Design a protein around this ligand. Structure first.
Ligand SMILES: O=C(O)CNC(=O)C(=O)O
Ligand SMILES: [Zn+2]
Lengths: 335, 15
């Protein structure tokens, strides 16, 4: 049920801005950063939306006019797509699946050029879609350094301490057109997802739903993404997609979503909601514990599977031999 | 070794 913005400003959004899917979902809890339940959840690596962290309070004034004036003259990675679904791919891995034609190109440009491109597309009533996704780095202007320094490091550093996480590895800046969709995938790092401008619908699935979401092969360029097209699920190829259940939420300015490591997430900028801006915080997960405790947790089995695929890749001398070997192993033997 | 080898994870994110 949509949240009513303060000052009686009506509903921030409504259901009609949500895309429709075949699976049911249940709400991710929205809580105060000071609520012990929110701590139990993060400790247990379950998603939670924190409403009042002030994690990126200085960024809440960011829009394209302000950033263009302040984010420096460095290069920004911008993805193009002829559709709302921005399927991404690892370039390094494109060698070993030549029957793979990309759905989205990456293009390096100056920020002001990206703003021009958006301006153009709107003006010309075009259909092309852009999505800026660029790591924050040294080349940013002084005003941005000051905003960045103003983030609530006291809070997030304590979170990194209490969870025994590794180092902050990066902050991804994401600027996206309304209707844009990042299809379901999982990441191998802990993620605090800080929403800044506009509204993003986030659908999460736990690691133990690996079986229902059918990730690409590890050596495929779309490694870690679901193969299932949520807009038209092929139940003949992916029968257990019929048993999938999401955790969902809509984050707005000031909201922080904890996306636990290995949790699948599908993310969309609300239809007719304007551009969206997010900054995320990626932390390496805690180390593997000295003593393993059985039964294994689902994310640990996903770790194992990934490793089996990787090793067979090396061992056979060719990742394209991995599938045939695995099938030889199970057919009439384990199935 | 084995188990610790099979349990180690990469750090792959996003793009
Ligand atoms: O916000 C998006 O569109 C996609 N973000 C992620 O997948 C992430 O932060 O891990
Ligand atoms: Zn992600």
């Amino acid at each position: 049920e949509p949240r009513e913005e303060a000052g009686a400003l009506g509903p921030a959004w409504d259901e009609s801005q949500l895309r429709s899917y075949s699976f049911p979902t249940r709400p991710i809890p929205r809580l105060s950063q000071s609520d012990p339940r929110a701590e139990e959840l993060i400790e247990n690596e379950e998603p939670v939306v924190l409403t009042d962290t002030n994690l990126v309070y200085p960024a809440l004034k960011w829009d394209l006019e302000y950033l263009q004036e302040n984010i420096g003259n460095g290069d920004f990675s911008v993805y193009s797509a002829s559709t709302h679904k921005f399927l991404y791919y690892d370039e390094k891995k494109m060698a070993n699946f030549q029957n793979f034609k990309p759905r989205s190109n990456r293009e390096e440009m100056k920020f002001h050029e990206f703003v021009e491109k958006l301006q153009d597309i709107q003006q010309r009533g075009g259909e092309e879609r852009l999505y800026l996704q660029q790591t924050l780095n040294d080349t940013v202007g002084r005003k941005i350094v000051m905003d960045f320094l103003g983030f609530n490091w006291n809070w997030i550093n304590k979170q990194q301490g209490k969870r025994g996480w590794g180092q902050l590895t990066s902050n991804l800046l994401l600027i996206g057109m309304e209707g844009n969709v990042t299809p379901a995938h999982y990441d191998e790092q802990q993620n605090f997802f800080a929403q800044i401008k506009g509204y993003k619908r986030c659908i999460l699935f736990p690691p133990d739903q690996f079986e229902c979401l059918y990730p690409y092969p590890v050596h495929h360029p779309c490694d870690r993404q679901s193969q299932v097209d949520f807009d038209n699920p092929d139940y003949e190829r992916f029968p257990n997609f019929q048993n999938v259940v999401g955790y969902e939420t809509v984050v707005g300015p000031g909201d922080v979503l904890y996306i636990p490591m290995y949790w699948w997430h599908h993310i969309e900028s609300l239809l007719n909601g304007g551009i969206t801006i997010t900054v995320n915080f990626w932390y390496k997960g805690a180390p593997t514990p000295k003593r393993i405790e059985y039964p294994l947790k689902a994310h640990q089995k996903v770790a194992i599977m990934r490793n089996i695929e990787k090793m067979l890749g090396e061992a056979l001398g060719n990742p394209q031999e991995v599938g045939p070997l695995l099938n030889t192993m199970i057919k009439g033997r384990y199935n | 070794e084995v188990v610790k080898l099979l349990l180690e994870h990469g750090a792959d994110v996003x793009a």
